[PDB]
Design a protein around this ligand. Structure first.
Ligand SMILES: Nc1ncnc2c1ncn2[C@@H]1O[C@H](COP(=O)(O)OP(=O)(O)O)[C@@H](O)[C@H]1O
Ligand SMILES: CC(C)n1c(=O)cc(N[C@@H](C)c2ccccc2)[nH]c1=O
Ligand SMILES: [Mg+2]
Length: 764
């Protein structure tokens, strides 16, 4: 394309040049001979047929191996004009290796985005490409998918075009495992709308800073990613009737609060703890009494304290500035540092047994003094209330003396709760900005849940995020395959139902329903003498041999102990039950929480102002609230693919990519676009939009039924009359026909305006 000059230096990474296009069309190729054949180490390899034995085929691979395969299992290659094409729905042969090798060949030229009919696939580059500069934001503005190469800016503007045209709320549903590119692609959508609203500022910059401010406190280094978002996020970008940006809401779903006090080896705590320390920043290490290196503050010192990909000194100032731009006042910004400083000291407190009483006493009090000073508490009351809490059972009060191991747990639970409530506060404080009281009518909702994880030790939080991913997959499955085909039968289109097999309700019912895994947790936390082995027994008794997705654990040697295994969509996940009743119930020491309410630090008193509704129950209802509100939107999906486990750029592993293409239903999602009628318009809206293509077809002032007008109009265009169908109230278009009708509309808008201009000369 000669128009690629508007994309500047980004152009080689968005489209192949015409110099490369002429090489593609001049490849040696025989349509009868060039085929894909399966292989073990890499899922499919290109091959050339050398002989035929009826239903058996034998072929020579790209790597010179001989192979023999059955005729149902060998799949024709696309001819070389379909090299690296931008939308895989337009291929002539559509199958697994056609999608695999089209993505691999685009990614090998660093064209990381590809369309898949109605949705887009993103393959993670471990290299910052220049395709995201604000000249490319300008270059994507108002271009259609028929024009511009695929990009996250294309999806953003396409959703924005639907929002204004349909007058319907839109959503961008970004999906993928951990390490896939979900968070930066979220940021680019947020960058796109902000810069477009700047090209038209304070709200535009603040919306951009809202991400790195939350990343300091909400992201952490994990084995799959150095910047894993330990919280799910939904961003509603709000627009007015004229389409200009008007507000944003951030909502966050479930922070991994156990990370605050516990980390596995080979992973970090949250970035905030290490970035304060690693700059050795003179003001913060004196104000927070945290003078040391990180290996002595117990809560953060386990795991890894340094990561090569992150220069914590520069990331500190980036997020310190982020809170400045978001208008956190000096006392607020200092206070939220103070609580992170206190939490570091709060894990160093030492307790010992009193010599006869089976009761804890403080062993060392210097680190409690530091904690109480920063938290504005009284240190004597803190240590007393931590060891000897008052508990009440109606009007009866009694002191229960804590043992040394369970006062340590009480310090852990309090440290988690301060951090969680401070992170929740910070979100509400970011949403105190960004709400600008400008009027709004529509939103585009960008979702970036915590992606799917399989660790060497999976716990209750890994269950919550993997459940959240499975629900969002079933949202895709229901929208693409069930709700789509219901509308064909509802409108009376000649359609016979196709079973794609993409259904997950058996595994969601195993978790959600009132006898499922989480429903056992909400009652087993209520019985005071229940235990984790009592839970595991009741869990197995209800589900082992009664749900196909609930299996016995497969403990391989060397890996830790796991107590059951779930057959999730993205893979089998083995879960350890220890602590789940405590984690679900979340009992805080009410005496020390009473000290927190009386804190001199204005933040800490606010966090615990106002403190049956277990965290699994809250999660399930927040997630069910989300997807009911999400069904009231037009969804755009972005499939983020991690190509490679080792994080090395441009390297791509075919089994790991194919696993993600299969379980995300990518091939099926294209097939319903090719087979079905993916575009459709009400006859009233069709007449409203496209009468300009042939104004003589539908003469107005006479009454005409909307169905009767549209049926006449569509025959006169000289588009293919087989590419559309008529329903009771909608016309239904095949894959490419709306893209053709829009191009026909824009050239006819261009023709009429230039002739209006010609008349504006003709009057002179
Ligand atoms: N589009 C991209 N361009 C450049 N680097 C990327 C891109 N997508 C991902 N990466 C690399 O992968 C890292 C992790 O991606 P991220 O979005 O944080 O993962 P997740 O999908 O788990 O949210 C990024 O910080 C960066 O190093
Ligand atoms: C995704 C699909 C179901 N669809 C369409 O196929 C057309 C829609 N509306 C028309 C009026 C339109 C045409 C061109 C650009 C934007 C919107 N809406 C839609 O929702
Ligand atoms: Mg993330």
């Amino acid at each position: 394309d000669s128009e690629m000059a508007v994309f500047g230096a980004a152009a080689p990474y968005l489209r192949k040049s015409e110099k490369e296009r002429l090489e593609a069309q001049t490849r040696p190729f025989d349509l009868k001979k060039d085929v894909f054949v399966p292989d073990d180490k890499q899922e499919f390899v290109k091959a050339k047929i050398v002989s035929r034995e009826g239903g058996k085929v034998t072929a020579e691979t790209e790597y010179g191996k001989t192979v023999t395969v059955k005729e149902d299992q060998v799949m024709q290659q696309n001819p070389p004009k379909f090299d690296k094409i931008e939308d895989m729905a337009m291929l002539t042969f559509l199958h697994e290796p056609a999608v695999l090798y089209n993505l691999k060949d685009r990614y090998g030229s660093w064209m990381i985005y590809t369309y898949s009919g109605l949705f887009c696939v993103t393959v993670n580059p471990y290299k910052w490409l220049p395709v995201y500069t604000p000249e490319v934001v300008a270059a994507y503005r108002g271009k259609k998918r028929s024009e511009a190469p695929p990009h996250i800016f294309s999806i953003s503007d396409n959703a924005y075009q639907y929002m204004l045209t349909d007058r319907e709320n839109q959503s961008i549903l970004i999906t993928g495992e951990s390490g896939a590119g979900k968070t930066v692609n979220t940021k680019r959508v947020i960058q796109y709308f902000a810069v477009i609203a700047a090209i038209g500022g304070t709200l535009e910059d603040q919306i951009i800073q809202a991400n790195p401010a939350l990343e300091a406190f909400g992201n952490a280094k994990t084995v799959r990613n150095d910047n894993s978002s330990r919280f799910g996020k939904f961003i509603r970008i709000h627009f007015g009737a004229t389409g200009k940006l008007a507000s944003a809401d951030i909502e966050t779903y479930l922070l991994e609060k156990s990370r605050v006090i516990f980390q596995l080896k080979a992973e970090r705590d949250y970035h905030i703890f290490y970035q304060i320390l690693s700059n050795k920043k003179p003001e913060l290490l004196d104000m927070l009494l945290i003078t040391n290196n990180p290996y002595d503050y117990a809560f953060i010192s386990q795991g890894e304290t340094t990561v090569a990909s992150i220069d914590d000194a520069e990331e500190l100032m980036a997020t310190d500035n982020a809170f400045d731009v978001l208008g956190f006042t000096s006392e607020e910004k200092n206070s939220m540092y103070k609580l992170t400083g206190a939490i570091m000291h709060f894990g160093n407190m030492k307790f010992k047994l009193k010599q006869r009483e089976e009761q804890a006493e403080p062993d060392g009090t210097e680190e409690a003094d530091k904690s109480a000073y920063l938290m504005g508490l009284n240190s004597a009351d803190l240590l007393k209330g931590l060891c000897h809490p008052r508990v009440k059972v109606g009007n009866e009060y009694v002191t229960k003396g804590q043992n040394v191991q369970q006062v340590i747990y009480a310090t852990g639970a309090l440290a988690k709760a301060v951090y969680e409530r401070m992170f929740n506060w910070m979100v509400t404080r970011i949403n105190a900005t960004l709400e600008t009281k400008q009027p709004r009518q529509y939103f585009i909702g960008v979702l970036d849940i915590a992606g799917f994880e399989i660790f060497d030790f999976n716990s209750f939080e890994q269950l919550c995020i993997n459940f959240t991913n499975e629900k969002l997959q079933q949202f895709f499955n229901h929208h693409m395959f069930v709700l789509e085909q219901e509308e064909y039968k509802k409108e009376g289109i000649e359609w016979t139902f196709i079973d794609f097999g993409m259904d997950l309700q058996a595994c969601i019912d195993l978790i959600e329903k009132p006898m499922g895994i989480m429903s056992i947790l909400e009652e087993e936390c209520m019985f005071p003498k229940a235990t984790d082995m009592t839970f595991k027994a009741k869990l197995f008794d209800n589900h082992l041999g009664k749900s196909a997705n609930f299996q016995k654990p497969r403990n391989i040697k060397g890996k830790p102990e796991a107590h059951f295994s779930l057959i999730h969509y993205a893979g089998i996940v083995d879960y350890n039950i220890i602590g789940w009743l405590q984690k679900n119930k979340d009992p805080l020491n009410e005496t020390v929480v009473g000290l927190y309410q009386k804190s001199s630090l204005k933040l800490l008193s606010t966090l615990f102002a106002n403190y049956f509704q277990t965290v699994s129950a809250l999660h399930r209802e927040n997630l069910n609230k989300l997807m009911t509100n999400l069904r009231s939107t037009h969804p755009h999906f972005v499939r983020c693919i991690i190509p490679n486990e080792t994080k090395s750029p441009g390297v791509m592993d075919n089994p790991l990519v194919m696993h993600q293409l299969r379980c995300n239903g990518v091939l099926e999602g294209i097939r319903i676009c090719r087979k079905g009628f993916p575009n459709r318009i009400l006859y009233g809206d069709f007449r409203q939009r496209y009468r300009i293509l042939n104004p003589a077809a539908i003469p107005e002032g006479q009454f005409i039924d909307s169905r009767k007008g549209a049926e006449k109009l569509l025959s006169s265009l000289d588009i293919d009359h087989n590419q559309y169908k008529f329903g009771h109230t909608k016309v239904f278009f095949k894959a490419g026909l709306l893209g053709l009708l829009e191009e026909m509309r824009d050239e006819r808008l261009s023709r009429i305006i230039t002739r209006i201009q010609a008349q504006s000369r003709g009057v002179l």
